[PDB]
Amino acid sequence: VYSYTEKKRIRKDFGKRPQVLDVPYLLSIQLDSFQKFIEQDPEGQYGLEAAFRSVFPIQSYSGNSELQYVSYRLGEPVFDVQECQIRGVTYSAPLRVKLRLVIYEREAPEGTVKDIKEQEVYMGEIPLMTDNGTFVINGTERVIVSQLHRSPGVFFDSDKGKTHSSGKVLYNARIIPYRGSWLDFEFDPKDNLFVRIDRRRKLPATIILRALNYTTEQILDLFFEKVIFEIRDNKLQMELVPERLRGETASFDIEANGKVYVEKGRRITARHIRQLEKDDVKLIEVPVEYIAGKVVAKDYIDESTGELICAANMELSLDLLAKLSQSGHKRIETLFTNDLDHGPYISETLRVDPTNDRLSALVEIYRMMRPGEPPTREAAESLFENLFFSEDRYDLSAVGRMKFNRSLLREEIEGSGILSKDDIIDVMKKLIDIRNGKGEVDDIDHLGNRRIRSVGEMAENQFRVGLVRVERAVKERLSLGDLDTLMPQDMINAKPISAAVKEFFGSSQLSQFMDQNNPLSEITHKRRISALGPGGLTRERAGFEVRDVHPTHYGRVCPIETPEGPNIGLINSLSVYAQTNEYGFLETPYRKVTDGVVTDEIHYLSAIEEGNYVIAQANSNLDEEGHFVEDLVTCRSKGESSLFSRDQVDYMDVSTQQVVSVGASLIPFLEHDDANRALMGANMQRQAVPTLRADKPLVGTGMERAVAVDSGVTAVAKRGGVVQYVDASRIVIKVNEDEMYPGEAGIDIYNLTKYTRSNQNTCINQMPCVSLGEPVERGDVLADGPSTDLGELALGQNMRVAFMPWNGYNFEDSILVSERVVQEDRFTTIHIQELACVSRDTKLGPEEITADIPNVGEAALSKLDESGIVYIGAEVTGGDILVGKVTPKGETQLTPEEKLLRAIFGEKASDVKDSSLRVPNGVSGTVIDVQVFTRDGVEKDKRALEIEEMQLKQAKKDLSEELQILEAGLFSRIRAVLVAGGVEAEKLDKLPRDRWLELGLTDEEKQNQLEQLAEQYDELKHEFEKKLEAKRRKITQGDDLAPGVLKIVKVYLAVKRRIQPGDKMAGRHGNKGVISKINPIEDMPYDENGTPVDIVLNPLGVPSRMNIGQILETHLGMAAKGIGDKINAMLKQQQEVAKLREFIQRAYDLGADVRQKVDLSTFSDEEVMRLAENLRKGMPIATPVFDGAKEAEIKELLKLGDLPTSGQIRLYDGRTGEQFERPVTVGYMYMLKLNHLVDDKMHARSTGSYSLVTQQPLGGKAQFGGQRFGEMEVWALEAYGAAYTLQEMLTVKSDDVNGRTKMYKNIVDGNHQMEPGMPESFNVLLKEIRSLGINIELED
Amino acid sequence: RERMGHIELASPTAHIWFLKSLPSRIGLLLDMPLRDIERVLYFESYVVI
Amino acid sequence: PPDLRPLVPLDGGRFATSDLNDLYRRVINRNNRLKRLLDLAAPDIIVRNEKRMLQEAVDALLDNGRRGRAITGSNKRPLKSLADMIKGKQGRFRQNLLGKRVDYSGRSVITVGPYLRLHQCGLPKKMALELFKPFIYGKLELRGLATTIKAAKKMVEREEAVVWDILDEVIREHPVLLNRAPTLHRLGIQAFEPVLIEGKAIQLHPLVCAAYNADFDGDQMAVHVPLTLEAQLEARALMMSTNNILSPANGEPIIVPSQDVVLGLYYMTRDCVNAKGEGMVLTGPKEAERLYRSGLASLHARVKVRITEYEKDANGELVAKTSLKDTTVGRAILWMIVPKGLPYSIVNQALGKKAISKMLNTCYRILGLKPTVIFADQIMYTGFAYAARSGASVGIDDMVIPEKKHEIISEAEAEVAEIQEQFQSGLVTAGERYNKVIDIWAAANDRVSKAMMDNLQTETVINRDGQEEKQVSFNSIYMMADSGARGSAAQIRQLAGMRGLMAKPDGSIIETPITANFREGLNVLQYFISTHGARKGLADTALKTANSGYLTRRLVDVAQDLVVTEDDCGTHEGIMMTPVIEGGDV
DNA sequence: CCGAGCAGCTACTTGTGAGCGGATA
DNA sequence: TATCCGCTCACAATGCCACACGCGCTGCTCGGCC
Ligand SMILES: [Mg+2]
């Protein structure tokens, strides 16, 4: 079974890996993200409930007045997406929130609140994305890319090498919340520990530790262990465990139980440890000079004198030892210090701790946070408790707590948003351990540590940023509001939140309009992951670590799709089968592998769980029953390829395309190309321009059937039905009986979009590709959009290409083209440019768009209409006034009598200024559409009336089609009900029943049914009239433009630009070039059969830049064309359908054990002829990214046709007419015309305008400006001689306000001699320095 | 292009370039640490004369 | 000054103002407020705070952001002060004093011009018209064609048939300056005589763009007009392409031929063992060219011809000697191009890149500069022509896979397997295992590369009245590689043979090599490791060109403070130059 | 009261060099 | 008290080109010898 569009023209496929997971929705990421944004979710989960329940409710300053939040709702969009595009307003929706003001009387803290005010209030509008994941803010379609940043949680960086130049590696722990204040623990070059709060002063960690009501003994018991020294008869015996002395030398005779164990000066070895553990002894004998090196743990108080003998973190001395012995403390707890197990880091941080108690710690940390402002202890504590433990300024999200609990090896993964003392204790212990040697650092180059945020999360963040401002506003407004004086509507304003969301969608480092030039760019732009913007690094401050791609990027992000230039690696494209995890990570599907069989199920593994299991090779030769043909298999354990067994593996790749992007999967024979060429090709395919007539690519990849369908460029069938009405503008389909709704249903209508300007000055047009009466299925394509062909992506065009030098015209990378290409309307494209004319309201009278243009003849005004706008279809090549804008300059109050008089008699209209808008000098073409928007109040000109009347006629045509269908059904029903009165029906109801429903007899049932049907009829008519009136009021409603404008006029100039020497064209393997010189058809080389070649590339570009696959593709292309040729030879000569069917079967049954297995005997024996007709142009061939056709398959496919097997054919010269030796290869290659047309690059200026800040010539191509003589150009010129040349290039041609005029006057008078003068910008610098307190002066 | 005017400041002020040169001119000329000169400049302390 | 302050009437009641205007206005506001407070006898603390605020305002006007608090005026962006209008890459020095935009300039995408001579270049018609409008006006006023400037301007706008000849006359000997966007050395800007061409692209000579480092994949270059007699004479005298044949860095010529011409000449001179007309005799190179173009003989075949060479004696004499040589028809045909001074031993070679470069070097050394330009031009012409007539083409069957590559790969696999067995036996540790795997894979890669080379050289046997006469391989990819045209040894090794070893992020070498090539299919993980290793080298240049530009700017700033101002200093001290022999031999 | 212009609603760069305490003999 | 060491702050980080876009709303304060 195959789809209906596949029955039109099924594409031959190769490959031997039967895929198990189909291609998912290419735009599922942003669609699912925005679906998670706007929806009623309980438990305050992602979207909008979290932002509300986190901020709301709000309470006054103990005023018993609370504002509760119940729910929210999104109203219907006030304008459709098409209406928003044609008008320019945003495709947004209202946000009505039902709030609850519960204010209660005084003298009752928890008194039962009464006089509840439950009210729905509107607060700003939010932009809704279309079915394609695009936002329409101001006419254009803006897409929000997903941002890759650091996952909230904890990280452990290892600063080595140059860091501190001391040869000591430091380890710094960073706690980064999702929203709040950071935390950073680190070590000095010494063994000191310090902490900082958001890049503040480096201060010790014991102070912030004791800030949370922590004493010294508690900290010491938490961090370090306890060594017990007992006061025995003498020698102060000590407990011993043979594992704590591992690695130390014996400074004394370690002997116990009357038996020597370790001698003085013997390092305790592992055998010594085993010997000391065999007897299991604890108490030994230790000298007096050994205790002096240790240090007491806790503060031991005296009971005789009531004083302190010794404090913590103070090394013991002999006098202190005698004191503590005479005090009576038998058990003395000391620290266990060992550089290999427990490095002393808290002891030093303790002895550098200036403050001891909790209160001075708080005031010191307050002084460290805020300069000065010395509070008391209770006033300072507010800051320390509000910065790290308040849920309003610390917002560790669910993924943050998850990563935090996973990093510290904790079972539970849930928690709160605020921190806790035990968490800080644990992270400090982890830092100490990772310094001691136990534990490894967490690299930043790991997808498990890099979190991806979608448009929904950024929108929620900005919503919260606005909500905190509105919260402060409503809190300061609630300071005076009392009971029974205000509804919960006036205290809330739309301003902050609405503006916040609007600016987040309008102007940001992520808010950009989509590059609407081809569906491939549309898909690769929405699946684009950036590292810039807020919360991400900058390209100017990025190291060689974020640019490099990790082995953890396998299947989660493409490694070959990257914009080469200023940001390499920072901007990537998501993988094909990559999905967004619930927590916000990159998940990749994998097939679960059991002992012997690989079950056809999928598990979406995360980034952290990759190293735990092992993944099997994607293209590993596998046997039946989910087995491997070989015992050993190529796998990867932890980002390292290796060789494993057939049973140790646990997971397999789902397919072979998940490693590349969707923009890279369309590169045929990608496995035969280098990484650099593949990157340059996949990037250039993004810049394809839609040709005038699309055409199927021969050497395809199979994925093309998805991009052109999964996107929103083509007309997809929402309900499969029968074609009713085919037209270039609209397509009307009749829904099948089953798919049709059982009530108030009808037929579907798709309004195709005609030639309209895109976001890159390209034409976007949809062409119907269905026939009348042809049944279509649901999801099938109906109309091919730009660069599409029967539901298949088709960017460029296939051409006959040879590879041989031709008189150096393909010198380095230049492309040679025959006149046959440009003559056949092949690469000619359409460019649509928008020109705006605004009638701004100024003083002295507003502007007019009339047609009375004085100081000019009729030739320049012959293209203007009665209203003052150029006609629809009026060509223009030079500067010509296409809209009659005039503005009054002096006295207003020009009487209408004298106004019409000036148009007939009298003098000219004075107060005009001739400020009309004309087309710039250099652009040509024919205007195809004019747009006008009039503010409510200004007189609508008759052209706007005509435009709205035309669109109303269109909408009325649709509504009348619907109404006539419903009325035909209803009249069939009335015929079915009055059949009882048959003779009068057939007599006086054949012609006149359509207007004479009035009948009557036999009341009981006939009157009942007739009345029911008449009621249905009048209700239907009234409903359709209501729909028509609503549409009229909608399309006639004037849109707002700006404060101080009357009307805005827009025109669209469409120019057809053909290929010419100077254009940039490229294949699909990074072989770019420029058309060197168009050639006559006779001069181009031709084969011994007479078919001339179209494109003659340079074969020398293949070896160095290793893109060989194209050649293969070329070969395959030839084979494809060959088959088509045969079909043409079978179509021109009238052949029976049996021979054609057998030939197509033999072609599709190529001997490669492919997974296609299509049969021709199942077709209708009629669509076979249509399919063959759709194959005479060639045989479309699909090719997986890595399972492509081998050499032998292409060889046998070529030998199927009459083409030579070697792929190289003898070629004759077009000029000399002789045979080229060394038979050149030739085939059919798919090429692309890049969006770098020469007509927008060539530019020149003799003498134009000059800047006002300094008298220097402008540049650019839009304005008539020259080029910039760069500083390196000045260096190269002064490296030469040319002193006069530099002096003229600097001031005489650019800056001399009085020299360039003199030089021009001399040149036009035949005088080639210059005058130095003085550069004006130098005087500008003199004035600027003089504007300062610095005096600059020229001497004699 | 060349005619200039002026502003008669009621209070004579310091030139930030000569005060934030690192080393600043006044910081070396007046043999006074830049911290104290900045303290005097922003009116949070006094200097005797 | 007021007009020096940017303030232009924007669309509507709003005006596009400067950042200095807000500064000056705030300064004036606070000054007026302070003057008011001083008259009302305000409290000491109030006037103190007012003086502090006025000080803040004036120091922000002087240099905003230096005090510590970068105030914003609009858009929440740092405001522009007077110091900001001088410093950085946006002050007057970097933007409006050193490099300024010039008039009479243009810009366009480049394209290959293979017919124009070395000293000239192409130029679009509309471009040339727009550049030389004043010269056209002057020449129109000269003849009895245009009385005033308005008539000439209208005729130029209309572009009558009487103005094209004027444009051809004004660009008869008026050179222009071609300039690449990134300028590195003196050759970043050159002078060329323009010839008018109907089109929108700039036709460029193929032998000069190599100096420009300008490929034809869409590079746009700029054009400038000298506009002065001194200027035109300087551009014709110094900045001309003919006057710059040796790079200022090294004495090696910068006019070295590119890949196309050298491939054509290599194919022309690469002789086979048997072809059409092997063993015959030819009188002169003209008869050889006649016999070749007639098709009665091949292009490369050992033939005994007679050459008439010329040798330069001690004085300016050119002695002539006629002798019979045994050379290929290609060399004999190419001999009609070289001037008389050069001997025949320079053509009787395979004529690779190094060979043709040293040939041009010897030509410039013996014959000077005047004939060297036309010699190189004729070299390029003949190379293009014969490379076109040759039919060089790369194909799938052209790249051959070594038949014994499979057994070598299997032997290396057995070796790494027994090494892993030894490691599992506990005898060898992990580091020595890694080293013994890396070196074994390197030896296997060297063996398979030597095999691929000696295989690409063989299977070229042709019967010349005998049984087998194995010769130099005529494979197209080998012709493009061995001749040094475009392909190197390592490139073709990665192409046909195994790619070898790759790298990991830190810089080490992975223990699993890429046992596949490009012609054969590449595994998914192999291609992943390949692109991982290649992205590093790709981003390398993209990040490093910035440091290169900064270094160039620093170096030129340290430079340009000295010129040759004396003819002799009159000292005797110097440096003792010695050939360094550290490390290797020398 | 009127009009005109202007204000509130931060942290993966790293390295280099210079300056300012600061603590150790 | 001199003097090396550690912490803090100023300054730098190609070049070109091409396209597109932007600085709002309510609120506050100053404007004026005919
Ligand atoms: Mg280039």
UniProtKB/TrEMBL annotation, chain C:
Residues holding Mg(2+): D215, D217, D219
Gene Ontology, cellular component aspect: cytosol; DNA-directed RNA polymerase complex
Biological process annotations from GO: DNA-templated transcription
Alphabetic keyword roster: Acetylation, Coiled coil, DNA-directed RNA polymerase, Magnesium, Metal-binding, Nucleotidyltransferase, Stress response, Transcription, Transferase, Zinc
Molecular function GO labels: DNA binding; DNA-directed RNA polymerase activity; magnesium ion binding; zinc ion binding
Record-annotated RNA polymerase N-terminal domain positions: 1-269
Binding site for Zn(2+) 2: C569
Self-association state and partner proteins as the record states: The RNAP catalytic core consists of 2 alpha, 1 beta, 1 beta' and 1 omega subunit. When a sigma factor is associated with the core the holoenzyme is formed, which can initiate transcription.
Family affiliation: Belongs to the RNA polymerase beta' chain family. In the C-terminal section; belongs to the RNA polymerase beta' chain family.
Function according to Swiss-Prot or TrEMBL: DNA-dependent RNA polymerase catalyzes the transcription of DNA into RNA using the four ribonucleoside triphosphates as substrates.
Name the UniProt record assigns to this protein: DNA-directed RNA polymerase subunit beta'
Naturally occurring in which organism (per UniProt): Escherichia coli
Chain's gene name: rpoC
